[PDB]
Design a protein around this ligand. Structure first.
Ligand SMILES: *C(=O)N1C[C@H](NOS(=O)(=O)O)CC[C@H]1C(=O)NC1CCNCC1
Ligand SMILES: [Cl-]
Length: 267
């Protein structure tokens, strides 16, 4: 009844903007779920950097890395959109600052730096997801080339569902121990790029941790979130979009609306 109405509204939303919306949304309290295209591949874009953040915290936990060890890169020519790494060019960042910045600011340099030195490249990142039972996630390329969002391209894609379940495992489950889990949570809650997406779909006093992605080709944009409504078990929302023509702009509003529809579906 609600599920049915939610999918009519979604498919009318994708018709309205002439592309493709993928949703999975979970109540971790009532186990109600809503899925639309939830097993299609969409480009990850910047959204994978929320999972990279977790990968970093797992290496810290294993004690291969210290969250406060200094990471230096004076040598380095920073990647387009390294808003945070560029200002710390002379001094170095701590590993934990760098990782948060990858997540919260979508800092490219931080992304590539961490994958080059700490995670074994894009197949390491891929391998990290496999290790938590996610068989859909694939990272093939580095910043910024992973953002081409070419139609029918496998590279640098995942599914709405797989992202949702993974975030569930990472943010809420038993992959990260207690202190490390708290940090990843605080990092997602601090994301700065999400104010027009899943955050716009929910009341002000709901707590939201998020990571967005904007490929900037085929109007490809996404967001995933953990949501803590006051007095309620967290929800996980995961929303991936593409559009039909290459030069079409991403739509913050389609995302926020699909979130609204998905949450009402599962609430
Ligand atoms: C990620 O999707 N990125 C990095 C950055 N933050 O994304 S957001 O969704 O967190 O706002 C902005 C755009 C995007 C990216 O790097 N896109 C490239 C811009 C330059 N060449 C085309 C793709
Ligand atoms: Cl180069």
């Amino acid at each position: 009844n609600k599920s049915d109405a939610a999918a009519k509204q979604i498919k009318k939303l994708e018709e309205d903007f002439d592309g493709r919306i993928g949703v999975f949304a979970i109540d971790t309290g009532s186990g109600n779920t809503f899925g639309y295209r939830s097993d299609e591949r969409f480009p990850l874009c910047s959204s994978f950097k929320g999972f990279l953040a977790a990968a970093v915290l797992e290496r810290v936990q294993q004690k291969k890395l210290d969250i406060n060890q200094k990471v230096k890169y004076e040598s380095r020519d920073l990647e387009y959109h390294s808003p945070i790494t560029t200002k710390y060019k002379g001094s170095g960042m701590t590993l934990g600052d760098m990782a948060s910045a990858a997540l919260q600011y979508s800092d490219n340099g931080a992304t590539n730096i961490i994958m080059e030195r700490f995670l074994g490249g894009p197949e390491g990142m891929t391998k990290f997801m496999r290790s938590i039972g996610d068989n859909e996630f694939r990272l093939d390329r580095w910043e910024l080339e992973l953002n081409t969002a070419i139609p029918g391209d496998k590279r640098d894609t995942s599914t709405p569902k797989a992202v949702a379940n993974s975030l569930n495992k990472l943010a809420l489950g038993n992959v990260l121990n207690a202190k490390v889990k708290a940090i990843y949570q605080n990092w997602l809650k601090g994301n700065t790029t999400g104010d027009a997406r899943i955050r716009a779909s929910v009341p002000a006093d709901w707590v939201v941790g998020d990571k967005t992605g904007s490929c900037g080709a085929y109007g490809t944009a996404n967001d995933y979130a953990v949501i803590w409504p006051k007095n309620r078990a967290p929800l996980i929302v995961s929303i991936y979009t593409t559009r039909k023509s290459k030069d079409d702009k991403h739509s913050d509003k389609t995302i926020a609306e699909a979130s609204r529809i998905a949450i009402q579906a599962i609430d």
